[PDB]
Scaffold this active site. Structure first.
Site, PDB file in Angstrom:
ATOM      1  N   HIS A  67       2.780  -7.958 -19.174  1.00 59.34           N
ATOM      2  CA  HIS A  67       4.013  -8.145 -18.950  1.00 59.34           C
ATOM      3  C   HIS A  67       5.087  -6.828 -18.739  1.00 59.34           C
ATOM      4  O   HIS A  67       5.967  -6.839 -17.748  1.00 59.34           O
ATOM      5  CB  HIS A  67       4.622  -9.160 -20.000  1.00 59.34           C
ATOM      6  CG  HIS A  67       6.122  -9.444 -19.968  1.00 59.34           C
ATOM      7  ND1 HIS A  67       7.069  -8.842 -20.593  1.00 59.34           N
ATOM      8  CD2 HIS A  67       7.020 -10.117 -19.016  1.00 59.34           C
ATOM      9  CE1 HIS A  67       8.194  -9.308 -20.270  1.00 59.34           C
ATOM     10  NE2 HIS A  67       8.163  -9.952 -19.201  1.00 59.34           N
ATOM     11  N   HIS A 115      10.059  -1.672 -24.582  1.00 63.78           N
ATOM     12  CA  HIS A 115      10.652  -2.747 -25.472  1.00 63.78           C
ATOM     13  C   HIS A 115       9.511  -3.591 -25.679  1.00 63.78           C
ATOM     14  O   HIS A 115       8.206  -3.465 -25.053  1.00 63.78           O
ATOM     15  CB  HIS A 115      11.453  -3.609 -24.655  1.00 63.78           C
ATOM     16  CG  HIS A 115      10.809  -4.645 -23.657  1.00 63.78           C
ATOM     17  ND1 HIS A 115       9.750  -4.206 -22.461  1.00 63.78           N
ATOM     18  CD2 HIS A 115      10.758  -5.945 -23.689  1.00 63.78           C
ATOM     19  CE1 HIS A 115       9.564  -5.395 -22.209  1.00 63.78           C
ATOM     20  NE2 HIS A 115      10.098  -6.513 -22.621  1.00 63.78           N
ATOM     21  N   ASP A 116       9.302  -4.460 -26.644  1.00 62.00           N
ATOM     22  CA  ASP A 116       8.381  -5.105 -27.400  1.00 62.00           C
ATOM     23  C   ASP A 116       7.417  -4.159 -28.057  1.00 62.00           C
ATOM     24  O   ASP A 116       6.454  -4.314 -28.556  1.00 62.00           O
ATOM     25  CB  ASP A 116       7.663  -5.935 -26.596  1.00 62.00           C
ATOM     26  CG  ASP A 116       8.428  -7.054 -25.995  1.00 62.00           C
ATOM     27  OD1 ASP A 116       9.616  -7.266 -26.374  1.00 62.00           O
ATOM     28  OD2 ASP A 116       7.928  -7.751 -25.054  1.00 62.00           O
ATOM     29  N   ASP A 266      14.487  -6.821 -18.068  1.00 62.88           N
ATOM     30  CA  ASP A 266      13.871  -7.862 -19.114  1.00 62.88           C
ATOM     31  C   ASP A 266      14.344  -9.352 -18.820  1.00 62.88           C
ATOM     32  O   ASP A 266      13.663 -10.204 -18.502  1.00 62.88           O
ATOM     33  CB  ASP A 266      14.161  -7.559 -20.369  1.00 62.88           C
ATOM     34  CG  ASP A 266      13.682  -8.269 -21.421  1.00 62.88           C
ATOM     35  OD1 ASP A 266      12.210  -8.715 -21.338  1.00 62.88           O
ATOM     36  OD2 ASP A 266      14.273  -8.736 -22.474  1.00 62.88           O
ATOM     37  N   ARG A 435      -7.185  -0.545 -54.364  1.00 64.58           N
ATOM     38  CA  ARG A 435      -7.855  -0.975 -53.491  1.00 64.58           C
ATOM     39  C   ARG A 435      -6.956  -1.377 -52.214  1.00 64.58           C
ATOM     40  O   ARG A 435      -7.263  -1.149 -50.992  1.00 64.58           O
ATOM     41  CB  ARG A 435      -9.247  -1.900 -53.602  1.00 64.58           C
ATOM     42  CG  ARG A 435     -10.241  -1.051 -54.220  1.00 64.58           C
ATOM     43  CD  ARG A 435     -11.337  -1.824 -55.008  1.00 64.58           C
ATOM     44  NE  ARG A 435     -12.227  -1.144 -55.682  1.00 64.58           N
ATOM     45  CZ  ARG A 435     -12.110  -0.353 -56.716  1.00 64.58           C
ATOM     46  NH1 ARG A 435     -11.040  -0.357 -57.320  1.00 64.58           N
ATOM     47  NH2 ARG A 435     -12.988   0.404 -57.219  1.00 64.58           N
TER      48      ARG A 435
HETATM   49 MN   LIG Z   1       9.621  -8.650 -22.415  1.00 65.16          MN
END
Ligand SMILES: [Mn+2]
Ligand SMILES: [Mn+2]
EC number: 3.1.5.1
Lengths: 498, 252
Positions: A67, A115-116, A266, A435
């Site tokens: 995308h 972005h993202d 976008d 841990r």
């Molecule tokens: Mn997007």
């Protein structure tokens, strides 16, 4: 006055270049940025984070990575269009862009790809799970005013203490900031502190999508309600964002001008692809979608956008068929919306250059926004509501919620104790917390140590800062996973494999 | 009172010797580090190096033998074979002599020391192996995760059987006599999953108590808990993992 030589800043925060530089040299700096980002694990992780549909076994369906590559192409188009419209008006040299045409495109192209990048595993819903988990632990609403008799904060050091303190103000911000995880805010944190990418100021300014601090509590200013819609940076990056604003000549709460282009890319590319995938998953046929689109546009005025874009592609699609409908739906949409966006950019260039324009390129008033509004409405009623999609969103919320509970021990620890865990590798009496601590990524642990060490040891606010940095550490680790790794780690630590 | 059986010191020494070397050999098998890397990790952690020390006589010896051997043996097979043998040839006689030299207190069972005394150079050789194993093997994520997973599995199992403990004496006792208790369907079935040998030991222990005593409910509860700890501790790793997943409904 408009001069992009003052905005397209090719300097860096660390080991920086200075001093004049030719057109070619500036080009090579920004191409270095491309190589830095393209080769980043954070971009590669985008192919196993999900965009709407569950990851199919035939890669027919979009991922966050594919995308974003489509968005990059849309941004490339809008930038190329702005520059060409501008070259024809002769404003290119007047606006200081003739030697920055390359970078101007590249920054937009890269801002799109990124972005993202800071988005957590299960998207909108990973964010939800993180913020909900910290809301029950810190209760930021219990710090809005006078200290509360029953402060529901779980942490001793973060509870509003009655004895009139200025420490209560830092407590207020820490509590609010940590409960506003935001992918865009996390992206800046990631490119700067976690991945140590050392990008140019202009490149980082391009992904600072909103200008609101995560610690913000009140009503947003009427003049900047759009630029401050969502959080844009964390408390942890305030000093860096201050260095950035000066370097980009931004007022407080102002946005970098190339950010509007990436945003429009976008807003455009956000939805059509999801309809194409819906047809691939056989949710509805291409014919059904045309009529779902015909019905939801309402009043047809034969000359309308609908007829020029979607009806046009429907007619073209007759004489392969779905490939043809979606190819021309995308193209028709681009050929009307990119010029509109590029023009909007030029017509509002003073405010956008100043970084204060309180609207989108595709503002709700436009017929163009109505075309995009059309795609969302069909997507919401027939795609995003699909049981397979919603189930994935339910599962993702539980997975991230469950991961945070597993690391609660690291948070339900005193400062003296947690520090002993950072100094000594083997802590005798905290075998589980030891841990658990080692499972945290080396890069995230390093960013905790670096931040903590830069604080003044003696301060009374030191334990407050430490807890904030410990909380960021956990959110860094969680938000950095892919959907699948987080799902796997959940199963592993809950024990379902060996 | 508090005296030990004399042969226990020998078994304790056998444990102390075998405690570690094998885990390094397995670490090389699991490709964690090469035998060459292991030699240098051991060379580094010994520090004060001399021609003549245990290190030289035991672990340096094995490193040289592993280099240029006949008997078409693997380098790693040869290194560890002679690491094992050399360690035994030095540490067994020392343990045996210590046993004899202190035989009076060992016989009386009051000797407040181990055979490989915490001071000696032989204990230093064993500490050498432990130091490397601790920093490079027991810290491996796969090991550490297994430890995390095990802790959650045994912890979770105990909660699944919590109902058997959240019951009064008369209630739990009714479950022991009647096989099917009408109103306690969950606790009933939980009770029958416990291995027969463990339920038998609970019945036997409680029946030996004086019925009328005021401490009976205290003793019963003690034995009830021992019942559960017996059931859990008697499992294998894989059985306990299996039962955990099954009783949370995740297998078929
Ligand atoms: Mn997007
Ligand atoms: Mn043993």
């Amino acid at each position: 006055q408009i001069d992009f030589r003052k905005k397209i800043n090719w300097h860096r925060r660390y080991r920086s270049p200075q001093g004049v530089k030719t057109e070619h040299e500036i080009l090579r700096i920004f191409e270095s940025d491309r190589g830095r980002i393209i080769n980043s694990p954070a971009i590669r992780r985008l192919q196993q984070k999900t965009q709407v549909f569950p990851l199919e076994r035939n890669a027919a369906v979009r991922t966050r990575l594919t995308h974003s590559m489509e968005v990059q192409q849309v941004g490339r188009y809008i930038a190329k269009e702005i520059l060409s419209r501008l070259k024809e008006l002769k404003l290119l040299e007047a606006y200081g862009l003739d030697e920055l045409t390359g970078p101007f495109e590249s920054i937009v192209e890269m801002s799109c790809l990124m972005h993202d990048i800071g988005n957590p595993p299960f998207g909108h819903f990973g964010e939800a799970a993180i913020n909900d988990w910290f809301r029950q632990r810190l209760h930021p609403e219990d710090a809005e005013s006078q200290p509360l008799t029953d402060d529901r904060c779980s942490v001793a050091a973060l509870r509003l203490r009655d004895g009139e303190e200025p420490l209560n103000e830092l407590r207020r911000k820490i509590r609010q900031d940590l409960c506003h995880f935001e992918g865009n805010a996390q992206g800046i944190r990631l490119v700067h502190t976690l991945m140590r990418m050392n990008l140019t100021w202009a490149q980082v300014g391009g992904i600072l999508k909103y200008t609101r601090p995560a610690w913000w509590r009140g009503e947003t200013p009427e003049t900047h309600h759009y630029l401050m819609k969502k959080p844009g940076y964390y408390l942890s990056e305030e000093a860096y964002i201050a260095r950035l604003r000066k370097e980009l000549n931004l007022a407080l709460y102002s946005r970098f001008p190339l950010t509007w282009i990436m945003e429009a890319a976008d807003d455009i590319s956000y939805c059509v692809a999801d309809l194409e995938d819906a047809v691939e998953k056989r949710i509805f046929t291409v014919e059904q979608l045309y009529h779902h689109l015909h019905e939801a546009w309402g009043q047809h005025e034969k000359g309308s956008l609908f007829s020029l874009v979607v009806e046009n592609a429907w007619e073209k699609s007759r004489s392969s068929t779905e490939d043809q409908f979606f190819m021309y739906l995308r193209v028709n949409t681009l050929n009307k919306l990119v010029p509109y966006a590029a023009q909007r950019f030029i017509d509002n260039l003073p405010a956008i250059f100043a970084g204060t324009f309180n609207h989108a390129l595709l503002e709700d008033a436009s017929e163009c926004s109505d075309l995009l509004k059309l795609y969302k409405n069909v997507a919401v009623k027939h795609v995003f509501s699909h049981p397979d999609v919603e189930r994935l969103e339910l599962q993702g919320y539980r997975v991230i919620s469950g991961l945070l509970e597993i690391y609660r021990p690291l948070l339900s620890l005193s400062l003296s104790d947690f520090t002993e865990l950072v100094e000594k590798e083997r802590v005798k009496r905290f075998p589980i917390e030891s841990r658990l601590f080692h499972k945290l990524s080396t890069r995230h642990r390093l960013a905790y140590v670096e931040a903590v060490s830069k604080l003044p040891s003696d301060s009374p606010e030191f334990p407050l800062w430490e807890y904030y940095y410990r909380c960021r550490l956990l959110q860094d680790y969680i938000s950095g996973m892919t959907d699948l790794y987080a799902w796997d780690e959940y199963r592993r630590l809950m024990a379902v494999e060996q | 009172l508090y005296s030990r059986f004399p042969l226990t010191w020998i078994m304790e020494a056998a444990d102390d010797i075998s405690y570690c070397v094998a885990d390094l050999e397995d670490a090389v098998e699991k490709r964690i580090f090469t035998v060459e890397q292991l030699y240098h990790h051991l060379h580094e952690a010994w520090g004060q190096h001399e021609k003549g020390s245990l290190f030289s006589l035991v672990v340096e010896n094995a490193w040289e033998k592993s280099r240029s051997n006949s008997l078409s043996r693997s380098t790693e097979d040869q290194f560890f074979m002679y690491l094992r043998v050399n360690t035994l040839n030095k540490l067994v006689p020392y343990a045996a002599q210590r046993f004899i030299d202190n035989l009076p207190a060992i016989f009386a069972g009051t000797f407040n020391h181990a055979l490989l005394e915490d001071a000696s150079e032989c204990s230093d050789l064993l500490k050498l192996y432990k130091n490397v194993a601790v920093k490079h093997v027991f810290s491996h994520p796969d090991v550490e995760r297994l430890e995390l997973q095990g802790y959650r599995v045994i912890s979770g199992l105990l909660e699944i059987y919590r109902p058997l403990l959240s019951l009064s004496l008369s209630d739990f006792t009714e479950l022991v006599e009647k096989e099917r208790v009408k109103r306690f369907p969950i606790e009933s079935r939980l009770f029958h999953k416990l291995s027969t040998r463990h339920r038998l030991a609970y019945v036997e222990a409680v029946s030996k108590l004086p019925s009328d005593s005021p401490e009976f409910p205290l003793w019963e509860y003690y034995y009830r808990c021992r019942l559960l700890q017996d059931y859990i501790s008697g499992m294998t790793d894989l059985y306990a993992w299996d039962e955990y997943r099954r009783l949370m409904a995740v297998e078929q």
